Amino acid sequence: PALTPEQKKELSDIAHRIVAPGKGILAADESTGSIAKRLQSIGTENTEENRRFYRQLLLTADDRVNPCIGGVILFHETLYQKADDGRPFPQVIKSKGGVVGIKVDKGVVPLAGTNGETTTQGLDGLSERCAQYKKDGADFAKWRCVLKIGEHTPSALAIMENANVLARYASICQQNGIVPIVEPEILPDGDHDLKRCQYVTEKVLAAVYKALSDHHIYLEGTLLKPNMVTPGHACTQKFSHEEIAMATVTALRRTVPPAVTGITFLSGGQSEEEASINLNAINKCPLLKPWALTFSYGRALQASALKAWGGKKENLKAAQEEYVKRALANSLACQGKYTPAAASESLFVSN
Amino acid sequence: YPALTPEQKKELSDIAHRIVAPGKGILAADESTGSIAKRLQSIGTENTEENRRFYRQLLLTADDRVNPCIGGVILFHETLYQKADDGRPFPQVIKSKGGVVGIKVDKGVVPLAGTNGETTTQGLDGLSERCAQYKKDGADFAKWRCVLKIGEHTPSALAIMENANVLARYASICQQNGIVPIVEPEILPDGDHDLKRCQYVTEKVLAAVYKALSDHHIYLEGTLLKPNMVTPGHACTQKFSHEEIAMATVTALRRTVPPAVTGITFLSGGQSEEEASINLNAINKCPLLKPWALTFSYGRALQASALKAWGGKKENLKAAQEEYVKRALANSLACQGKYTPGAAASESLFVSNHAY
Amino acid sequence: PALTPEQKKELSDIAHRIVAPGKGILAADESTGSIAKRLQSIGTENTEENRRFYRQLLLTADDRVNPCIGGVILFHETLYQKADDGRPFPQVIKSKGGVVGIKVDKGVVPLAGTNGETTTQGLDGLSERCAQYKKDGADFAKWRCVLKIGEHTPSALAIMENANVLARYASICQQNGIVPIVEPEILPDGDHDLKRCQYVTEKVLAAVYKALSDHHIYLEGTLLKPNMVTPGHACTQKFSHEEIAMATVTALRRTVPPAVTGITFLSGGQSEEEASINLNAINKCPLLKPWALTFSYGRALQASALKAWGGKKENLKAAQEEYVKRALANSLACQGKYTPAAASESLFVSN
Amino acid sequence: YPALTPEQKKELSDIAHRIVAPGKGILAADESTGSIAKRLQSIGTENTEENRRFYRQLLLTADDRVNPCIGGVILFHETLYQKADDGRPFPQVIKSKGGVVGIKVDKGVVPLAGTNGETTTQGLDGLSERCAQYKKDGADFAKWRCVLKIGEHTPSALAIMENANVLARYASICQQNGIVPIVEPEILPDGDHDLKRCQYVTEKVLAAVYKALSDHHIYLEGTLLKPNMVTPGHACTQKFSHEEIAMATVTALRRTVPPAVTGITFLSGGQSEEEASINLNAINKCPLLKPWALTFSYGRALQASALKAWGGKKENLKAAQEEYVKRALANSLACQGKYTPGAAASESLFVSNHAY
């Protein structure tokens, strides 16, 4: 047996907290190189104190966020940083009613023989890392795999390998009391339409859950972090929020066992507002959906806050109020009760 | 390159939903001729076409209190072409009472070389033309049975994969020709294993099945599954409550069966008529979320009392029919969570390596 | 264990006879509908006696064929027919030093969900059929799967299913003392070039042998019947007999364990003469090749005999001498010693 | 979309052929630091960088009678950057004697949750940049070890598949960066199983490996394999002749290893120096056709006498070296079928769950 009954209950508990009703996740875990591009976009230098101040900005927003945010995914460096008032960032997060999460993958690597496809690395020593992260206050984890729709992608070799590394990663995580968020991202890059994303999404989740079965993963103690199902970014043809919602809820109904505790969508380049509108179309779909359907958003919670901060410490409480509007909009959207410029900008970046 | 058009998928889904509409279940009257003989020998009756015609008729024409109970009826090939005394074809007897007509299409288990007594099922050859015909002739769903066993080194990786593949080939051919497939990967109760063993293996098997149905591009909303409940093995020394069997069973399905599956219609196994109904009722009362219909596809466990009451004697026709009805009514309340409860219906109906 | 030591030795023996040095197989097993098209091509009516006379024509050719032909694959009907002199056709075949073979597949069937791909049927009741065929004098068997190179073919589902039915078929065959000839045909249809056939050939054999392992097949008691590796039929670009030979011998070296007793190529639409020339390029390749590399030819042994018969009983010994020249040319070609109109005709037919 | 250009494939194949050119074999001096300690404790010597530097030097600088014997030498990372007393880097000592320089790149076994004590190996992270470096620094082949065990329900389907996958990832990254991979799927001798058990399992494992290398688009002609011989288990009561071990071993390879594989360099296992050489010789004398080089990649079984003779004492340097040489000469005649034959070289070198 991979896990005892006591360990199993710890993971089911943690997982049910994160996606408790009306709650989602703040995906604040950009690498140093990734937060560089977002900082550069607003003229701000990429320094440890600027990254600490921006992350402090988001975690210390006012208590209206506390029922909207069940967990916060951090990057290594940030997990060991402190707020201005001396408190370490994980206590800041718990103090407001959220679970601390840590991103543990070490990025993507090319898979030879293929048309530009990648797998993901980071399992070397992961068991010790997780033990220490759990000791230092993290209770869930994140791993991101990346597949792309092209004419000979996602490859069979690609789907199989990424599904297998996901499951390893998750086996290790649960051995150490850490709930794994399983992230199989199909990028929106390309001109494919909606049905094609739906075919490819179904195909990839089927392989993911098979691989999870094979490796003995306790599914009640996992979260699934999939793309919404949407046309490609360069698709000429257009589709409604209902067509997207149907197509996403259909693909997940056909592949994800009800035992999975929560589905926390990535935004994938969607504008802040479209991400919220779609998330709401999905939770208003009449079809039966046996799991939480909520948000795990990075860019679609932070773009308005970033441009309202501008790097200027005076703008803190305008930036913080921009985050809290998107945090509140999504908490309503994952219950179907959201019906409403920098929030309308496409956030799509190639790869 | 899609397997099915949007209309083909709507017909298949409507059919699958009529069969498990709330309160309803399936009567499996689909015994092979050599299998049903072993039943009539047990009530001292010769195995003639006419005694088979008569006993089937008794089940199909029981009074109209069963109609809200019976969503589908699975027939052996022979029976699909037989007629009541009325002269009405049995398909039409079934339809007129509100049920969908089903047909068993497998051709029995065969052994897998190099394994400890494990089997696949055969019957794909010419299946597509057989289905087109069965569909012209009134059938709207099919059944195919695969058999796995818990044992030392069984079910092996080979048997789990080969059996799931062939269920996937069967399912794809049925849907091309208009017919909802019931996917039955039966794990036998033979052996002394405990409940958790049977749960582990059931989860492994059903994950392999639904990966195979995905690889073969099967339309799940036009499917049903007929699995075993998660039960201790037949010879197991230890005792498990009905609520433990409900927990293990609902948990095993929630870990493997995608919500898109329209329904799960359990086989009775070796269980007695009364145990089959109580476990099914405890299952529908499990407060865990269960996004599919949980109902019955019972062969022995709808017919044990009827067959003992009938005894071979034309004079008991109405007395047999009544015992069948009382069980169909029991299982209709069980398949809604509302069954609160003789010797025939408490008797174990277990047979080593069930075959039909 | 699938098989005892005594059964294993019977199959290794049979398999080594068929592909003994300088010997190949006559693939005379066309269905009734398939021999119709070849008969119609020469004006002859498709009647049982005409099919019996044509098959009698080939099996009763003079004793110069006896060291060229190790086995003869027949169709059901023919296995139960007799020569003019009363002898049943299998005794005719054995009397000249060859093994009787029987084709046991029941043709191809479409696989739904795919771009025109098929699997193959015929396992229903195959175990009994083989028991009876073995009793009636057959000692090996044939099963044909068909894959096609197009832009999304051979599919993963297609390769996996055909590899699995091959292995079933072969498990049954060996249980009954019958050596299975495993036929994974990649058709030459299309405009693909040589490397693409080589990639696809390697990919399909890798899956075939894995599937054979999984099902416990005794490989010393099998034969492999693959396509040569060649450009597609509509390829503009041109390739030498050496390039074909290298590419075929490379693909097989990379996928077929040395334990396989013999490789008996299908001709696939090649002209009688090209089939012979290529077979010889292959056996003259200096690279190491641990198995017999020989012929299992239907069309490329019979086209000249068919057109020389013309349906006229007077032409019997001109037709029979045409077969015996192609039989002798190939027996030399599978040893590298063949160096030399109706024999130059492309025999390619779509599907 | 090819993994490798025609030149990349020629470099990889030339390298693979130098290493197993006829008569030659591999010296595996690639012990982890915590593993080699367990060796020097056995001759009462402290495990210091300098005692490790010295013992490796003794093996690498043995007289030039070993050069026709040793095609490659696998080094632990530490040793690749050490120098002889000459001041010459050990890579250059090896090259100058006619051998190819190898490097162990795995990072040890880790456990697989949910299994009976089974493991994968780890070490892919940053492997590509590690290889580029190792290649700049003189290394032309790599080694990665996976460990499987025969037991009740092991090796399981999970462990067989996961271990083959990760050997395939390792192999593809090595070839991108210029380096011939040695694929080592070691099946341990622990247990009391017989020879046929170990043959069955070896055939199952090597079929999974070579399916995985195909799925990952690995260039087999630039590969080597280091498997175990097919041997009875360490505790097996029954006795098997060397010719039976040759039969089972050559048969297992001929059923699974494609002829394109350039060579098979066996690990010694728990075998004594003398048994390792005799079984390897019986293997090369098997008259069955064997289209690949059959030679040695021996760690313990090239070094047991050398290490006991050296004893930690600088004065025995030439006496240790001589024992190593005599074994390298024995295994060079064995790896051609021509070995006709002390206590150190008859001693079992078995250790429960070998790790390094």
Short mmCIF file of C-alpha atoms in Angstrom, two decimals, chain A residues 23-348:
data_model
loop_
_atom_site.label_atom_id
_atom_site.label_comp_id
_atom_site.label_asym_id
_atom_site.label_seq_id
_atom_site.Cartn_x
_atom_site.Cartn_y
_atom_site.Cartn_z
CA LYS A 23 -12.33 29.44 -3.22
CA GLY A 24 -9.55 29.12 -5.78
CA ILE A 25 -5.74 29.42 -5.92
CA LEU A 26 -3.37 32.31 -6.55
CA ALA A 27 -0.62 31.06 -8.85
CA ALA A 28 2.16 33.38 -7.73
CA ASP A 29 5.05 31.04 -8.51
CA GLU A 30 6.86 32.55 -11.48
CA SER A 31 10.52 31.65 -11.68
CA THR A 32 13.04 34.45 -11.44
CA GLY A 33 13.36 34.48 -15.22
CA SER A 34 9.64 34.49 -15.73
CA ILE A 35 8.90 37.34 -13.31
CA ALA A 36 11.63 39.23 -15.08
CA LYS A 37 9.53 39.52 -18.23
CA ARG A 38 6.49 40.68 -16.28
CA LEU A 39 8.57 43.22 -14.30
CA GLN A 40 10.34 44.48 -17.40
CA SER A 41 6.92 45.00 -18.95
CA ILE A 42 6.40 47.75 -16.32
CA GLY A 43 9.91 49.25 -16.31
CA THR A 44 10.81 47.75 -12.92
CA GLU A 45 14.21 46.22 -12.28
CA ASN A 46 14.34 42.47 -11.50
CA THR A 47 15.83 42.53 -8.00
CA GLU A 48 15.14 40.37 -4.98
CA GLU A 49 13.60 43.25 -3.08
CA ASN A 50 11.34 44.20 -5.97
CA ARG A 51 10.18 40.58 -6.27
CA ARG A 52 9.73 40.45 -2.48
CA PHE A 53 7.74 43.71 -2.55
CA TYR A 54 5.51 42.56 -5.39
CA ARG A 55 4.82 39.25 -3.69
CA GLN A 56 4.27 41.07 -0.41
CA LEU A 57 1.83 43.30 -2.30
CA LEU A 58 -0.32 40.31 -3.30
CA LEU A 59 -0.22 38.22 -0.13
CA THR A 60 -0.96 41.12 2.24
CA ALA A 61 -4.10 42.34 0.47
CA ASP A 62 -7.03 43.16 2.67
CA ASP A 63 -9.22 40.59 4.33
CA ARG A 64 -11.85 40.66 1.62
CA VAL A 65 -9.70 38.17 -0.20
CA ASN A 66 -9.67 35.65 2.65
CA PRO A 67 -12.77 33.67 1.52
CA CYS A 68 -11.69 33.83 -2.16
CA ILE A 69 -8.26 32.22 -1.88
CA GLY A 70 -7.83 28.67 -0.57
CA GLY A 71 -4.16 28.31 -1.47
CA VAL A 72 -1.21 30.25 -2.80
CA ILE A 73 1.45 28.62 -4.94
CA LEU A 74 4.89 30.09 -4.35
CA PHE A 75 8.33 29.83 -5.89
CA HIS A 76 11.23 28.52 -3.80
CA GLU A 77 12.74 31.94 -3.07
CA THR A 78 9.42 33.42 -1.98
CA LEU A 79 8.66 30.61 0.49
CA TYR A 80 11.69 31.72 2.50
CA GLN A 81 11.07 35.51 2.33
CA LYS A 82 9.39 37.67 4.98
CA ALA A 83 6.88 40.51 4.87
CA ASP A 84 7.81 44.01 6.03
CA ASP A 85 6.44 43.23 9.48
CA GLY A 86 8.86 40.33 10.00
CA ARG A 87 6.34 37.51 9.43
CA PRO A 88 7.52 34.80 6.96
CA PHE A 89 5.36 34.70 3.83
CA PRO A 90 3.78 31.27 4.58
CA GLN A 91 2.46 32.47 7.95
CA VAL A 92 1.14 35.58 6.16
CA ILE A 93 -0.76 33.20 3.86
CA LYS A 94 -2.09 30.85 6.56
CA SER A 95 -3.07 33.79 8.81
CA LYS A 96 -5.63 34.72 6.10
CA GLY A 97 -7.04 31.22 5.68
CA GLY A 98 -5.07 29.74 2.86
CA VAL A 99 -2.86 26.74 2.21
CA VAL A 100 0.76 27.29 1.23
CA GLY A 101 1.81 25.67 -1.95
CA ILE A 102 5.23 25.23 -3.57
CA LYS A 103 6.24 24.74 -7.21
CA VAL A 104 8.75 21.89 -7.46
CA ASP A 105 9.37 21.27 -11.13
CA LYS A 106 12.65 22.37 -12.65
CA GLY A 107 11.30 23.41 -16.01
CA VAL A 108 10.91 21.75 -19.37
CA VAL A 109 13.45 19.89 -21.47
CA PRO A 110 13.40 18.88 -25.13
CA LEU A 111 12.46 15.33 -26.07
CA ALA A 112 14.64 14.13 -28.89
CA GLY A 113 13.10 12.63 -31.98
CA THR A 114 10.05 14.90 -31.91
CA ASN A 115 8.79 18.12 -33.51
CA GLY A 116 9.76 20.42 -30.74
CA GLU A 117 8.17 18.63 -27.86
CA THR A 118 9.27 18.65 -24.24
CA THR A 119 9.08 16.67 -21.06
CA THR A 120 9.63 18.16 -17.60
CA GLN A 121 12.42 17.58 -15.15
CA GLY A 122 12.82 17.84 -11.38
CA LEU A 123 12.38 14.42 -9.79
CA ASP A 124 16.03 14.13 -8.73
CA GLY A 125 15.97 14.52 -4.96
CA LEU A 126 12.32 15.56 -4.96
CA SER A 127 11.45 13.40 -1.98
CA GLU A 128 13.84 15.21 0.34
CA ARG A 129 12.86 18.61 -1.04
CA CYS A 130 9.20 17.86 -0.24
CA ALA A 131 9.98 16.68 3.26
CA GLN A 132 11.71 19.99 3.92
CA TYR A 133 8.99 22.04 2.20
CA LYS A 134 6.36 20.32 4.29
CA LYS A 135 8.43 21.14 7.41
CA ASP A 136 8.70 24.76 6.31
CA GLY A 137 4.89 25.11 5.85
CA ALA A 138 3.96 24.01 2.34
CA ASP A 139 1.09 21.53 2.12
CA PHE A 140 0.53 21.14 -1.64
CA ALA A 141 2.75 21.24 -4.68
CA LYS A 142 2.79 22.01 -8.37
CA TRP A 143 4.31 20.43 -11.43
CA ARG A 144 3.86 21.66 -14.93
CA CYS A 145 3.98 19.65 -18.16
CA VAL A 146 3.59 21.34 -21.55
CA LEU A 147 2.13 19.86 -24.74
CA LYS A 148 1.33 21.64 -27.99
CA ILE A 149 -1.21 21.05 -30.78
CA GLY A 150 0.56 21.03 -34.15
CA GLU A 151 0.14 18.64 -37.04
CA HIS A 152 2.22 15.81 -35.42
CA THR A 153 1.91 16.92 -31.82
CA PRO A 154 1.07 16.02 -29.08
CA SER A 155 3.02 12.94 -29.98
CA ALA A 156 2.35 9.50 -28.53
CA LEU A 157 5.85 9.50 -26.99
CA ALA A 158 5.13 12.98 -25.65
CA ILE A 159 1.77 12.20 -24.04
CA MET A 160 3.10 9.00 -22.48
CA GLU A 161 6.26 10.57 -21.04
CA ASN A 162 4.60 13.67 -19.57
CA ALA A 163 1.87 11.48 -18.14
CA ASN A 164 4.51 9.36 -16.50
CA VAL A 165 6.53 12.10 -14.94
CA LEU A 166 3.37 13.67 -13.58
CA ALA A 167 2.59 10.44 -11.79
CA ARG A 168 6.05 9.90 -10.40
CA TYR A 169 6.07 13.50 -9.13
CA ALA A 170 2.71 12.86 -7.48
CA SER A 171 3.71 9.54 -5.91
CA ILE A 172 6.64 11.27 -4.24
CA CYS A 173 4.51 14.19 -3.16
CA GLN A 174 1.96 12.03 -1.39
CA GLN A 175 4.62 9.90 0.31
CA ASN A 176 5.61 13.15 2.10
CA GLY A 177 2.21 14.45 3.12
CA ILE A 178 2.04 16.90 0.20
CA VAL A 179 -1.00 17.11 -2.09
CA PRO A 180 0.10 17.22 -5.77
CA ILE A 181 -1.53 19.60 -8.22
CA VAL A 182 -1.16 17.74 -11.51
CA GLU A 183 -0.69 20.27 -14.39
CA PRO A 184 -1.02 18.86 -17.92
CA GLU A 185 -1.11 22.06 -19.98
CA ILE A 186 -2.13 22.02 -23.59
CA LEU A 187 -0.97 25.38 -24.86
CA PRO A 188 -3.41 27.52 -26.89
CA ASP A 189 -0.72 28.15 -29.55
CA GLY A 190 -1.85 27.61 -33.17
CA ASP A 191 -4.85 27.86 -35.50
CA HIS A 192 -6.74 24.71 -34.44
CA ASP A 193 -10.40 25.08 -33.63
CA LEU A 194 -12.47 24.05 -30.61
CA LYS A 195 -13.26 20.42 -31.39
CA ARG A 196 -9.54 19.75 -31.92
CA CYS A 197 -8.65 21.06 -28.51
CA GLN A 198 -11.44 18.95 -27.13
CA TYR A 199 -10.15 15.79 -28.83
CA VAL A 200 -6.65 16.51 -27.64
CA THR A 201 -7.73 17.41 -24.13
CA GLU A 202 -9.71 14.19 -23.72
CA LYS A 203 -6.80 12.19 -25.10
CA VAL A 204 -4.27 13.68 -22.69
CA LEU A 205 -6.41 13.35 -19.55
CA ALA A 206 -7.18 9.75 -20.38
CA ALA A 207 -3.47 9.06 -20.45
CA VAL A 208 -2.84 11.09 -17.32
CA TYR A 209 -5.36 9.17 -15.20
CA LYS A 210 -4.27 5.81 -16.54
CA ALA A 211 -0.72 6.71 -15.57
CA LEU A 212 -1.92 7.82 -12.14
CA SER A 213 -3.68 4.51 -11.67
CA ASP A 214 -0.57 2.56 -12.70
CA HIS A 215 1.52 4.42 -10.06
CA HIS A 216 -0.99 3.99 -7.22
CA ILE A 217 -1.87 7.64 -6.70
CA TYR A 218 -4.55 8.48 -4.15
CA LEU A 219 -6.85 10.58 -6.30
CA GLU A 220 -8.94 12.06 -3.49
CA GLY A 221 -5.68 13.71 -2.43
CA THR A 222 -4.86 15.28 -5.81
CA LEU A 223 -5.96 18.31 -7.74
CA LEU A 224 -6.13 18.53 -11.51
CA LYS A 225 -4.93 21.72 -13.19
CA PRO A 226 -5.97 21.51 -16.87
CA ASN A 227 -6.41 24.06 -19.66
CA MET A 228 -9.91 25.16 -20.41
CA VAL A 229 -10.94 23.83 -23.83
CA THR A 230 -10.79 26.70 -26.31
CA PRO A 231 -10.01 27.38 -29.98
CA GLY A 232 -6.35 28.02 -30.75
CA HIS A 233 -5.10 31.57 -30.41
CA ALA A 234 -4.81 32.05 -34.19
CA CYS A 235 -8.20 30.51 -34.96
CA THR A 236 -10.18 32.75 -37.28
CA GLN A 237 -13.45 31.11 -36.31
CA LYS A 238 -15.19 32.32 -33.19
CA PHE A 239 -16.94 30.51 -30.32
CA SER A 240 -19.15 31.59 -27.43
CA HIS A 241 -18.53 31.27 -23.73
CA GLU A 242 -21.18 28.59 -23.70
CA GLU A 243 -19.51 26.56 -26.46
CA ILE A 244 -16.25 26.78 -24.54
CA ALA A 245 -18.05 25.84 -21.33
CA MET A 246 -19.83 22.82 -22.84
CA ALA A 247 -16.65 21.65 -24.49
CA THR A 248 -14.60 21.92 -21.32
CA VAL A 249 -17.20 20.30 -19.13
CA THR A 250 -17.73 17.53 -21.66
CA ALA A 251 -14.03 16.72 -21.97
CA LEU A 252 -13.62 16.51 -18.20
CA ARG A 253 -16.76 14.47 -17.68
CA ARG A 254 -15.42 11.92 -20.11
CA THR A 255 -11.96 11.43 -18.53
CA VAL A 256 -11.63 12.57 -14.87
CA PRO A 257 -12.93 10.12 -12.26
CA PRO A 258 -15.27 11.66 -9.67
CA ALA A 259 -12.78 10.78 -7.01
CA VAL A 260 -10.57 13.74 -7.99
CA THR A 261 -11.23 16.35 -5.35
CA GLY A 262 -10.90 19.55 -7.41
CA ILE A 263 -10.24 20.91 -10.88
CA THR A 264 -8.33 24.21 -10.79
CA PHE A 265 -8.06 25.72 -14.26
CA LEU A 266 -5.08 27.57 -15.70
CA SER A 267 -5.94 30.78 -17.58
CA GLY A 268 -3.51 30.13 -20.44
CA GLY A 269 -3.29 33.62 -21.89
CA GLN A 270 -6.93 34.52 -21.55
CA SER A 271 -7.62 38.04 -20.44
CA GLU A 272 -8.38 38.55 -16.79
CA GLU A 273 -12.05 39.06 -17.66
CA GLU A 274 -12.52 36.28 -20.20
CA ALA A 275 -10.97 33.80 -17.77
CA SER A 276 -13.60 34.87 -15.21
CA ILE A 277 -16.50 34.80 -17.65
CA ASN A 278 -15.59 31.35 -18.93
CA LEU A 279 -15.03 29.98 -15.44
CA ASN A 280 -18.60 31.13 -14.73
CA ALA A 281 -20.05 29.61 -17.92
CA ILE A 282 -18.49 26.36 -16.77
CA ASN A 283 -20.03 26.40 -13.30
CA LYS A 284 -23.43 27.31 -14.77
CA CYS A 285 -23.41 24.35 -17.19
CA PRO A 286 -26.40 22.13 -16.23
CA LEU A 287 -24.46 18.91 -16.89
CA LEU A 288 -23.44 16.92 -13.83
CA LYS A 289 -19.95 17.75 -12.50
CA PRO A 290 -18.78 15.74 -9.48
CA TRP A 291 -15.75 17.87 -8.50
CA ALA A 292 -14.96 21.48 -7.63
CA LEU A 293 -14.50 23.47 -10.82
CA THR A 294 -12.49 26.54 -9.79
CA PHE A 295 -9.45 28.71 -10.60
CA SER A 296 -5.66 28.39 -10.19
CA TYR A 297 -4.72 31.67 -11.91
CA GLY A 298 -1.43 33.47 -12.21
CA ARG A 299 -1.70 36.02 -15.01
CA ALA A 300 -5.47 36.38 -14.79
CA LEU A 301 -5.35 37.56 -11.19
CA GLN A 302 -2.24 39.76 -11.46
CA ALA A 303 -2.15 41.75 -14.73
CA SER A 304 -4.23 44.70 -13.49
CA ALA A 305 -2.37 44.74 -10.16
CA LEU A 306 0.97 44.73 -11.98
CA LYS A 307 0.19 47.68 -14.21
CA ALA A 308 -1.44 49.57 -11.33
CA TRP A 309 1.74 49.13 -9.21
CA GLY A 310 4.08 50.36 -11.94
CA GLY A 311 6.92 49.72 -9.54
CA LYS A 312 5.92 52.70 -7.36
CA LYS A 313 5.46 52.05 -3.65
CA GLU A 314 2.76 54.77 -3.59
CA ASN A 315 0.53 52.71 -5.87
CA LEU A 316 0.46 49.76 -3.43
CA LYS A 317 -3.16 50.13 -2.37
CA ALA A 318 -4.42 50.76 -5.91
CA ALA A 319 -2.59 47.68 -7.14
CA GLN A 320 -3.79 45.66 -4.14
CA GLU A 321 -7.36 46.72 -4.80
CA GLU A 322 -7.04 45.53 -8.43
CA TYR A 323 -6.05 42.04 -7.26
CA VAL A 324 -8.92 41.96 -4.81
CA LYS A 325 -11.45 42.77 -7.52
CA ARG A 326 -10.22 39.89 -9.70
CA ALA A 327 -10.02 37.66 -6.61
CA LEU A 328 -13.64 38.49 -5.80
CA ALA A 329 -14.82 38.15 -9.39
CA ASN A 330 -13.42 34.63 -9.64
CA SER A 331 -14.75 33.54 -6.28
CA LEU A 332 -18.18 34.38 -7.63
CA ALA A 333 -17.38 32.79 -10.97
CA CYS A 334 -16.57 29.38 -9.50
CA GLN A 335 -20.16 29.39 -8.10
CA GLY A 336 -21.98 30.74 -11.17
CA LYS A 337 -22.81 34.06 -9.54
CA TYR A 338 -20.54 36.34 -11.54
CA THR A 339 -22.45 38.52 -13.94
CA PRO A 340 -20.73 41.90 -14.38
CA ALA A 341 -9.08 47.63 -20.10
CA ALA A 342 -6.11 46.12 -18.42
CA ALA A 343 -8.65 43.42 -17.48
CA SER A 344 -9.52 42.94 -21.18
CA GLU A 345 -5.98 42.56 -22.52
CA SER A 346 -5.06 39.24 -24.04
CA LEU A 347 -2.23 37.82 -21.91
CA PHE A 348 -1.08 35.29 -24.51
#
